[PDB]
Amino acid sequence: YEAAATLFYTPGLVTKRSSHVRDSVDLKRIMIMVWLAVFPAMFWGMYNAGGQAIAALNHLYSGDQLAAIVAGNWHYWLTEMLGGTMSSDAGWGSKMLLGATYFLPIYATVFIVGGFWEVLFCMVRKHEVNEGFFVTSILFALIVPPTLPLWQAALGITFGVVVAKEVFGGTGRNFLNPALAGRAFLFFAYPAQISGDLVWTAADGYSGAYALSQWAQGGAGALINNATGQTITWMDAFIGNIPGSIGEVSTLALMIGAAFIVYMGIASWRIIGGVMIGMILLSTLFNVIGSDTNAMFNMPWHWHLVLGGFAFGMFFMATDPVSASFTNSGKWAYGILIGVMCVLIRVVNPAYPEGMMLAILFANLFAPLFDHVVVERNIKRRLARYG
Amino acid sequence: MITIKKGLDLPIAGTPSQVISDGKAIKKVALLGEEYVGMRPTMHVRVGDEVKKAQILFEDKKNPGVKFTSPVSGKVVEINRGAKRVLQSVVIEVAGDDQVTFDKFEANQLASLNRDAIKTQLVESGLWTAFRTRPFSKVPAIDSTSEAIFVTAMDTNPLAAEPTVVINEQSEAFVAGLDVLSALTTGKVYVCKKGTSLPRSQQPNVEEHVFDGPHPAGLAGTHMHFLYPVSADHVAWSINYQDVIAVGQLFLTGELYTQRVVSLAGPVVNKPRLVRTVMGASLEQLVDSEIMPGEVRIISGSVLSGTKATGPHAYLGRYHLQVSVLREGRDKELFGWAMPGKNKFSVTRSFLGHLFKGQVYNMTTTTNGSDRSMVPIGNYEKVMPLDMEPTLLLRDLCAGDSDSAVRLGALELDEEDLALCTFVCPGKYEYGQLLRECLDKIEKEG
Amino acid sequence: MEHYISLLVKSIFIENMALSFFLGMCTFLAVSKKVKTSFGLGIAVIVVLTISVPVNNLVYNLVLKPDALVEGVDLSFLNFITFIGVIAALVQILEMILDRFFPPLYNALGIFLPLITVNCAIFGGVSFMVQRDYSFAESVVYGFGSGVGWMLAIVALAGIREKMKYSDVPPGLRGLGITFITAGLMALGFMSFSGVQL
Amino acid sequence: MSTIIFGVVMFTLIILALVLVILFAKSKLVPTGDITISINGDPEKAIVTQPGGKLLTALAGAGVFVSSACGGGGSCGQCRVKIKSGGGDILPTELDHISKGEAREGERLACQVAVKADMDLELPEEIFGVKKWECTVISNDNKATFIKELKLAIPDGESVPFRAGGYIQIEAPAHHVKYADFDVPEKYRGDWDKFNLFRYESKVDEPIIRAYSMANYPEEFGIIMLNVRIATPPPNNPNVPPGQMSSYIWSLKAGDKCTISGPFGEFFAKDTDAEMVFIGGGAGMAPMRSHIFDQLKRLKSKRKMSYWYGARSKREMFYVEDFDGLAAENDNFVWHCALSDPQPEDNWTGYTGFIHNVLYENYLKDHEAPEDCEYYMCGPPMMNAAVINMLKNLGVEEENILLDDFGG
Amino acid sequence: DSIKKTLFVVIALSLVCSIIVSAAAVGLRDKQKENAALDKQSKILQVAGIEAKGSKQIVELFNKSIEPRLVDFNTGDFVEGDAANYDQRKAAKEASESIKLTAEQDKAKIQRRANVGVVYLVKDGDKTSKVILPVHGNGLWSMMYAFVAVETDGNTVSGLTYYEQGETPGLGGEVENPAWRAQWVGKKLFDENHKPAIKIVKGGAPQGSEHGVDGLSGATLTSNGVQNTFDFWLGDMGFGPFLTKVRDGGL
Amino acid sequence: LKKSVLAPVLDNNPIALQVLGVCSALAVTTKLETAFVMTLAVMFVTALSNFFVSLIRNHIPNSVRIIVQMAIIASLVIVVDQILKAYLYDISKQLSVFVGLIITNCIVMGRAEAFAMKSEPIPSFIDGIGNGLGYGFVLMTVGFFRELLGSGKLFGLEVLPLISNGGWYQPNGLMLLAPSAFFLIGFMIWAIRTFKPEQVEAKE
Ligand SMILES: Cc1cc2nc3c(=O)[nH]c(=O)nc-3n(C[C@H](O)[C@H](O)[C@H](O)COP(=O)(O)OP(=O)(O)OC[C@H]3O[C@@H](n4cnc5c(N)ncnc54)[C@H](O)[C@@H]3O)c2cc1C
Ligand SMILES: CCCCCCCCCCCCO[C@@H]1O[C@H](CO)[C@@H](O[C@H]2O[C@H](CO)[C@@H](O)[C@H](O)[C@H]2O)[C@H](O)[C@H]1O
Ligand SMILES: Cc1cc2nc3c(=O)[nH]c(=O)nc-3n(C[C@H](O)[C@H](O)[C@H](O)COP(=O)(O)O)c2cc1C
Ligand SMILES: Cc1cc2nc3c(=O)[nH]c(=O)nc-3n(C[C@H](O)[C@H](O)[C@H](O)CO)c2cc1C
């Protein structure tokens, strides 16, 4: 059908004006290179989400009760039918297959539901179907817990695509992050399914606390993996053995993926440097001033980095070219504000245990202000005939 | 010594060999009518009229007093009119040697002429059209004077000629032209040049300023931004080295000098070199038997800011000093965007081509992609050496804003200064025409 | 003195009038087109609020508080008329003695100069001050912080709308609908400080 | 009850204190100045009615009006003022009329300027010379279906200070006019009586003013000749309300009293040597006749001229004797005509249909340089668009297309 | 305009408006307080279990069955005063009759406590069966106020009702859920060592336990707020001495 | 005829075109009880203020016109507030500040300045009623969606059973917050300007 050939093939056009020779880069290649960057993170996330579910299920149930539970859920009996096993010694194959059966429905639902609105708008306004949804859909499907209902994911992606992105004019015209706008819609509308201890480990009847919110209770000594009984170390939280969403669990994979797109120039290193500087400064100020009743005042920078969705946000979600600043002088300020706001929401605000998604949305509002400040300074320098 | 840090030396194949050789005999010239900004002609000649050299072809209605003259003596053959009866070109068949003769001056007396006496001779001879005023790139008004004239004297365009080769043949004419410009300026003459040596004029008004770096260093806009910033209250004239040689020869001999040394080079040329030609020649018979078979695009100027030479426009421009030929790319390719290209060029590091240092590409006319919205990954900031906000200025131009574009600095720029920004745009936007529309709106709202 | 710093930061960020209490939208959505005009109006609002709150505090403490003038009498039902009279007189003074007699703010203050009187933000600030029972210095700091927060919000909206010159909005949502949706997105983003105990 | 008296007293005291503060502040600052404006330096006339506010409310009260039209608000922009001292602020509504260039030298509209402080003006000389008059009507005879020519005589032999193509601002006091006594020649009786047009009537409660253009030329001094059209409901929608002032002027008879207010003008002829092209329709014969007679009988010009006219039928043409005599007298001036739908008894031969189409197919297509000659258009707004499109397709600049229109 | 006319116009308008405004705001001053008292009386009746669907009978039922009474926290004994018009909020606010709690003992995070409190005794004739104790503490978003009705033995709770809170509905605003409030009946507040034995446990409490109460699911911060509220108000600084006197009899 | 009272419902809607009274729309639309009470209160206050201002339109000096109008409007709002506290105490406890903020409602001042000062008393009263109806239309329409989707109720009555009470509906938490009001008003404006193209704004 024509909907496939027009995607695979290049249009085969020629230049007719101005620069008769053009650069080989294009939006399709940019979006595809970003889409491929999250593949190692997604694969390790699927593996870890299978492993956590298997471990929690084995810790809770055993024997006949375990068989009754395994025969009552379609993820478990599909994993058992496809050759996998739910025993205590399941291999990486089954640990990845269970995560796949937990993640693929969410990705398919998000893709189809968002693409419907994308096609509808780009057909009504007589455009050609753009790209960037290939990135938005995968980021949204990676930043949600494995147990999120499909009817909630559909509404989240609907809000993110329609209200936040498509109303303003489509790709390259919006001012806010679409994936994070949808996630914030879900976060504020249905907070029982995106918070608590029941949503991170995809096991039936198992309640396991957030690795980030286990710190606010008792400090570094309170970090424990109740699924297996072991304690979470920095190496575990860095490699990505902690419970969490599909996407942001692994940090080594995120660094590996984001190094390529930083090298290729798609993602700016200025925003990443600003985020790092802000986080380090604020999270060292908090340690220096100290506190007695708050246990997050003593969390250092290298523990802020590994836990939560900090790495995923900083690498893949804070570097959105459209939402970020357009000035090399304002990109540093944008990154510093993002890092400072994330650390502040983590430490001082008690209602929300994680604040990267809200910090990015807050800095998206004030990026144009930084752009205006720098451009006004440049104009005032021009008026002195020195520019 | 002024060093430019940002830019892009375009690695297109077929670089010319800087040796001047005689070109093909040219039996037809033309003087275009779509390259002069805001020029509304009043034709003084008709098809079949016989014209001498330096005899006026048409005047201006928006710029009274400026006269455009015939490069060679012959018979007019075409007055081609485009859409809405716009003047595309006036074709003259060179069939004679008669000419109009002007006054002659000793080489010593050229530094003390009156400005009005210089202006009258320049306008009568037709060399007044060599100058251009930044902003708006219009031909200078007959009675206007500026205190800064920027003799380019350097070439950094892709597949461009080396001015040191051309000037050393005409050192005396170049010196005399510099003396005339120093007597005419009333300010200073900024003779931009590379680190190599050039003939020197013994005048205090003339300054030699040395530039360096990649392509945008050899642009009159960059020279003005770095030596004499321009605005609505400060206009500066611009001129190249060959027109300076023409001015010197005019004031030394009394006859207009209509020779040229252009560089015929490109990916699809058998033997790139410098060919001695005539002003406004016919490219269709200039490039015959010099091109490999197949479909080709012949350009009158650099591939970054040239003009396609097909049909009525298939003649050399006034301000262009090189002819570039490259193949036409029309075929599609399956999964071309996903290929880890070794032969593909990009300022970004997303292709395997950039790893191989020193590679030269056989670039074609394809737009590698399709028209989309602008996602500013940071390509314009890599290739803009000026003190501006590029990705804000281009968004201002695309949105149609004019006053804010002026505030951001659109006046100092020309269509030739946004060629690299158009080149490195993932959205495949053409910014030169947007800037020209913006400047036309600014001029009208005067 | 840390109490005043806490009050200032709380009023500016934790309790931003424009995007946490949502007062003054009738002008917040209508005048926010250019940063210059938005900054001028924010300065005017800052001045009016800073002068209005302490005077109302003095009057309420002196005569309108229950049992404050004569024991057994309670005149707390003149609050609305007294507050609106003080605000209106101050706005008239600002418009007529200082703003236009001195070098004027041409096109920075137009139809919206007499609209400060009916700006809901100032009346809301006075009412909240009455509820919280501040002292004089706390009232001054509260007024200044509220004004600065309102100016910050309006200037951020103006900057966003200036960035939105490149957008392509549907004809129905041109201008006002898109302004409402943009303000809703900004309010969604401004919920980071919701649970802070400052 | 004791709280009620306290509340009443405190309400009164607080409101009185606020009002007194406002009044005292006003008394401490109000300039209370007067005569803050000088319309020019040389003339002694530097007096107005108001110390500030809007500018017409001070000048028109003292008798100065560029054109103090009804309502104001710059809906037509004839209230032209030039300023050189005072506030330089520009109303948002004034950028539409004033370009930045004119803004630097201080050009604005009058119904937008607000006066508060001292200033001096540099008003053009035409303000100092315009005046009203007492012209009596001589003839108001009909010569077409909707076209009437009005002839007036100037009292005491004065000559209006006008140029070719101008217009005087006619007045019409309160009146009530009926169409019953209207009567046209026998040929126009058919279409006139098809709806009979006499049942119509107009109500005028206060004096009203519109403008008309002179069909005469400066060597016909002592007599004002105009081309007046009747304002009737459109034939396709007769239920549309009719026109008032045009009907009133139609009702004017010979020997009747009339008052003009003064001549104004635009659309003048350029002082060049290029060819002149005059194109028009409907009631547009007035400026074209004025220009033709000026250039030929008054200016003795020898520039090549052509006057292209379009009509509907042979019965719809007048001034034919005049234009034929002028063409016979002058070789440089040739005038052509076309009919939209000629009738079998018109005995018409030659051009037919739309005037722009006949022009393009007959003259300008074979013209060598249609971009150097000057065009003057004054006619129907629907002919305006067609002629503009044709000339722009031929490639004529805006400076060579000089047109006069009455805003559709 | 002239001052002679402007002052007269302003004075006449003020004299026209002020009588209306003052008469409206003074005539209704009785109803404006009856309506306020009705809400508290209805809440107390609901906590005590007496059914009164109407402001007509709420007044008589509260006047006959419920006897408000003041209690001194420091002495744990009754005080004589206008209990029916007491204002605990302003009493705690004023520094004249309040104690500034210190950090180590301000478990409920209320930062101030009144010197004398108010309790309500439910009785018929002159025999008392219950006593309603108003307790409050800090939650997550706002202050949470409640009435807890304990039996005359000083141990057994016969109902808990939250009448003022501002938590998130559906997540932490489940303190007003009848399914959650109805499980407090029969629970015991003290152990044999006179320690506060009420424990809001997470994830569910053993069925039939005399000291455990089911926590709010997904609302651990609000559950901790409730736990702090009870650990403070049942402690030494709250109704501790008063309940010590109560369990000995003579309530 | 009823053009004055019927047109400002859609033709000249205050919130949709004039951008007047939006703060109360964002605030009090969470529940239909408060929305309807606010609609009635603003209707009565606007109508009576317009009536009195038109009655005394001749004898208002320019210098203290704002004070003269605010005296009347604040007196009306004080009377309304006392009546609400006396008879509708449960509702009045919920509106709180946005009952005293009726004075600073921009609709009241806009209709007092634009129409009341220069129109006859009865036309002013009719125009006030019409503007109040046009405002209440938006108030109740937004409140319908907000209440129904955020609490599964209408006027305090049960319509959609809640999951916490043994039903099937899981309430949306955004409807009880402010951004939902912004989104609903934006989409209302979109639909109104789609059905009535004459109100569409220009690109320039
Ligand atoms: C500088 C200048 C010179 C001019 N010179 C001439 C000249 O020489 N000769 C000439 O004939 N004209 C001339 N005009 C045209 C001018 O407009 C004349 O006055 C013309 O006769 C129109 O009459 P009026 O101004 O009385 O129209 P008005 O009575 O002001 O308007 C009535 C017209 O509007 C219509 N109308 C009224 N109410 C409505 C309604 N509710 N709905 C729809 N339609 C309605 C009527 O049917 C009628 O067409 C000139 C105009 C200008 C600006
Ligand atoms: C790519 C790397 C770029 C960043 C380079 C390094 C930046 C770090 C700067 C500060 C160095 C120390 O940073 C941090 O200091 C604080 C003390 O100040 C230490 O803090 C430690 O001791 C304090 C003592 O009061 C405890 O309360 C705290 O819980 C504990 O972590 C952290 O363990 C250390 O990580
Ligand atoms: C938007 C939002 C609002 C919340 N509101 C409350 C609340 O009002 N009360 C509460 O106890 N928890 C609330 N929570 C949840 C807490 O933040 C915290 O995650 C939870 O109380 C801990 O659950 P657990 O320790 O029982 O696993 C809210 C969470 C979100 C995302
Ligand atoms: C480095 C990079 C990061 C991106 N991040 C996001 C993101 O977080 N969310 C999203 O919806 N799109 C993202 N996109 C896609 C696209 O840029 C985005 O939709 C724009 O905001 C256009 O609406 C990203 C693209 C790139 C190149």
Ligand code: FES
């Ligand atoms: S009426 Fe035209 S400017 Fe005043």
Ligand code: FES
């Ligand atoms: S209507 Fe303007 S502040 Fe509320």
